[PDB]
Design a binder for this molecule. Structure first.
Ligand SMILES: Nc1ncnc2c1ncn2[C@@H]1O[C@H](COP(=O)(O)OP(=O)(O)O)[C@@H](O)[C@H]1O
Ligand SMILES: Nc1ncnc2c1ncn2[C@@H]1O[C@H](COP(=O)(O)OP(=O)(O)O)[C@@H](O)[C@H]1O
Ligand SMILES: Nc1ncnc2c1ncn2[C@@H]1O[C@H](COP(=O)(O)OP(=O)(O)O)[C@@H](O)[C@H]1O
Ligand SMILES: Nc1ncnc2c1ncn2[C@@H]1O[C@H](COP(=O)(O)OP(=O)(O)O)[C@@H](O)[C@H]1O
Ligand SMILES: N[C@@H](CCC(=O)O)C(=O)O
Ligand SMILES: N[C@@H](CCC(=O)O)C(=O)O
Ligand SMILES: N[C@@H](CCC(=O)O)C(=O)O
Ligand SMILES: N[C@@H](CCC(=O)O)C(=O)O
Lengths: 294, 294, 294, 294
């Protein structure tokens, strides 16, 4: 096979080492790790080489984007150029772009029939009481966002709390914001990692005693997971709907059933690899091998 | 006919008055002008009504988005909900979203065969000299952007100027940036306004004595325009490529021929309407009449 | 007398007209209104002229700073240069600078013996429950700030509300934040305007039905005020403590007595002038006349 | 002696270790290292304890502020509270605050007779040519700032370069900006470190081949320095003028003589300690011992 594979990222972290590793090992591929920010190119005379530190890049059979949440406009532009040059991407630019927008993505998942928690959208709602009654929740989660980021989640246990919180963020200097109801669960969500058409690995993320969260480390403790066939199907459908080749789907276990809470196009590998012992980076290179033309 | 038409904008300016005007006059349509930021809704149980100041909106046959460049994530979300409810939009969410990204849009136009000025893309280029030689320019225009905004253009007449400018912005706190070569022209660009499959109006925008620009009012003076059939074709193709129903295409007259410099999905009406006397707002309502189902 | 007076502000609003007016009328002074942002100067060879639109400014006997809350670093720099050139300022740079910092100012007022509401300071407090118990409040006001701005106030009626709010802002992307207890009062605060050593005018600002606020227009309705001699003394002491020549002091009427809530170095004139009929702009020019050397 | 010493900083870096080290070793002082952001307190009932992670801090004989450039408003507030509680600070709040403002500080140094390079100040100058002629430079350095930060320096070798650069930043989204002329020197500046009334250590910082800079590591290489008695006097006067107990003064060797380029209230220790072998952290604790009351 022997492919030249580029990896779009800003630095060297476990994920970056684990695939330089798995690509050099597996069918003896060459790997260059490029900062997207350091790429520069003529978007005009259509295609045209990509430049990096004064030299022309040599044509990659494939590109592995792993673009940061704060560099996603330029990142996807550079990604787009690689695509136009013939490189196969796991996760294509459009898909990556759209996925960063949690609003667009939640909308899309909902339209395609995927069970989410009931969720409200707002920015400067003008009648908070009506917004709270919509969504139904008396206890619910409010998630501040600002553009396409996320700068906070918070639980509002009472009506008044939910009121004061929304009224706080309403001062648009916090910008777009999301309401959805809290769970049974217990600060425990399941993170499935999809590569192509299968769930490749899956862990339970568990909260700490102080309120909830559950985030990777907002106090989070990982443990290996027992996914139901139903959860497995869902997490694969979610990625398919988002047109993501690699994705992290987070699932909450509600009484009514499993609910998708979020979908990531650049899931971290370390926690989930170390927890399960699964060679995820390898399943990714393997996927490239099945799909990239050389 | 009698349609209910919503207009998505944050305030009442000429454009907003001129179509409340033209819609109430023309086939007696009703019009509500809504702040997108004041809309709130359940993106979950797919579709679901849109709320505004404590009440449910009553279903619009059509929506005219005119979303601001700084509110485009939430704006398009609200737009998307109207679309999911059955409202026809002139300019659809996806198209609007993509168009805000000048990088993606320049790329797309270039791929589809549309003559642009030669243009470079960069963020933190690491070898400015190579970047300047690429693009070729010895005098060229550098356009700072930051996300999806634009916070400056500047002419660099010499190599050294172009160097110091790029090196200035390279400190990423300016983020993404665009290089392209300057013109003959003379601070004069042509702005065509496309509605559907025709150019509906067109003006010459003329710079002032102090350097160049030409911007609406960076010193700009408008006058009525004599578009060549070729320019006309191009400006229509550009909008088609971008999948925009209404668009402002800006064209520079180079020796080699007309070049598209920019495409806007929310062109201002005042300057161009007053300059030409053309009823543009009416051609927009008319377009809705030909395409919205009631 | 005949002074040349400069006014540092970014535009022409009532305040700006009302003193061009009162200075040309009163002892026939000349007035130039300058954008601080348009001033440029050598901070080196100590003193040195200030340049404005290509020319050297002609030496002002006095400067009236009215610098915006978002331009206060450069504004005060330009102010400082005028001071170094010999111009008398009503409100000096240091005083203006310090006053913009509500934290430093609240601290200072408290140290000097001036009754404030009980007030807590926090940024990323780590134990919200302890923070709420400190301050004592079960209902209290949380005021988000971010640098030196203010981007929100909110009432938290219960413990849980106060919790969810603080936890929301704790995500430092909101930065510094202030807790203090709510009042009897009733959305009514008294705004006194101090010029030199007297309160020159004073209005009642009254909230609307929807929650509280009281802000100028967050729904605010003004009416003429009956200040107690005690309130009068306090508002004069506050300005003295802050070393402000002109200041807006806001006072809340608590059971225990009058409490200073805020001190502004650039109070607006329109609402308070129109409400009372007092010639405030004139008392300001008069103050300059008593203190500037010609 | 035996003092309790608090160190205000956000994390554990060499500087933070080297004084936990030197304070526990030297006259057996106790040391707590506190995040300023985690402090919370009643700025009202004047003084009042400082809270940290749910508990009351136990009263420090001294505080060593080492506050970050992006947290300086809240940092100095917390600092101020310690001061009000009786703790001696090396570097007091006012001094630290003022020092962060490079504009105010450059002004002050200039007024007090300290030779700087000739320096211009601007934000949106309206006539760049006049600004460049002022300052005199044909080659000069332009330093972008934005509030109180610094987000770039750049050399402009020609008039045109200097023009395009200033015109670029003029789009206020870059905000305040500084012009001063370039040097002989050669990317080499001298950094002196003042503790109290002496220069305690001093290094040469040397640029790399690619343009200039010289910054700690913008390519910087350190080497031990031979300060003239004159340079020594100056660096001590600068700190005295700024009322800083500990400061980093940077000096450029011009033909006309040594020029102060910058003064820092929180100089890094690592580069300069390792380069010279001097126990700087110890001279700081020693200074506290000579000045703090127990
Ligand atoms: N609607 C909800 N109900 C219950 N728990 C939630 C809800 N939303 C978020 N959480 C918890 O808070 C944590 C933070 O969620 P979020 O930041 O939205 O996703 P992620 O964990 O992917 O960053 C999650 O891991 C989850 O356990
Ligand atoms: N590559 C170029 N060559 C010559 N002139 C240009 C170039 N780019 C921009 N200009 C001039 O500068 C003005 C500012 O352009 P820009 O801000 O990119 O577009 P818009 O005018 O749509 O805001 C334009 O009207 C144009 O006349
Ligand atoms: N601690 C408090 N108790 C009661 N009412 C308050 C309190 N703080 C603020 N308010 C009300 O909210 C309004 C907003 O206050 P703020 O924005 O801090 O001051 P300003 O009115 O000077 O902008 C005030 O006019 C006041 O009436
Ligand atoms: N006016 C000047 N002339 C020559 N060299 C300069 C000038 N200003 C800055 N430099 C060089 O550029 C580097 C960056 O300077 P700056 O960022 O202002 O200070 P610091 O090095 O303290 O961060 C300096 O170390 C200095 O060597
Ligand atoms: N959220 C949209 C999809 C957005 C998109 O296709 O880009 C939907 O309901 O289908
Ligand atoms: N710029 C891309 C198109 C982007 C898109 O389709 O969203 C191209 O070359 O086709
Ligand atoms: N807040 C400080 C005063 C701040 C200052 O003097 O700048 C005090 O308690 O005195
Ligand atoms: N730069 C001012 C000093 C500023 C201050 O004292 O705070 C001067 O020329 O003295």
């Amino acid at each position: 096979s022997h492919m030249k594979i580029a990896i779009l990222s800003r630095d060297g972290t476990l994920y970056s080492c684990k695939r330089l590793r798995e690509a050099a090992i597996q069918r003896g591929h060459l790997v260059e790790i490029l900062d997207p920010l350091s790429c520069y190119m003529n978007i005009n005379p259509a295609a045209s080489s990509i430049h990096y530190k004064g030299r022309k890049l040599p044509h990659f059979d494939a590109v592995i984007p792993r673009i940061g949440t704060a560099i996603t406009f330029y990142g996807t532009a550079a990604l787009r150029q690689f695509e136009m040059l013939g490189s196969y991407p796991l996760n294509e630019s459009v898909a990556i772009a759209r996925a960063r927008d949690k609003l667009r993505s939640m909308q899309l998942l909902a339209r395609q029939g995927i069970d989410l928690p009931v969720t409200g959208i707002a920015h400067s709602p003008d009648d908070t009481s009506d917004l709270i009654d919509m969504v139904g929740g008396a206890p619910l989660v409010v998630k501040l966002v600002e553009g396409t980021q996320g700068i906070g989640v918070v639980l509002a246990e009472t009506r008044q709390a939910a009121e004061s919180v929304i009224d706080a963020f309403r001062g648009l200097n916090a910008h777009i914001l999301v309401q959805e109801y809290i769970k049974e669960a217990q600060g425990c969500d399941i993170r499935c990692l999809v590569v192509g058409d299968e769930v490749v690995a899956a862990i339970e993320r568990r909260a700490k005693e102080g309120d909830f969260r559950s985030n990777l480390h907002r106090g989070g403790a990982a443990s290996v997971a027992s996914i139901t066939p139903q959860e497995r199907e869902i997490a694969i459908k979610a990625a398919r709907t988002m047109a993501l080749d690699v994705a992290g789907v987070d699932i909450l276990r509600a009484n009514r059933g499993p609910l998708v809470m979020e979908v990531n196009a650049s899931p971290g590998l370390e926690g989930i690899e170390k927890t399960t012992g699964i060679d995820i980076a390898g399943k990714m290179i393997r996927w490239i091998e099945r799909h990239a033309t050389t």
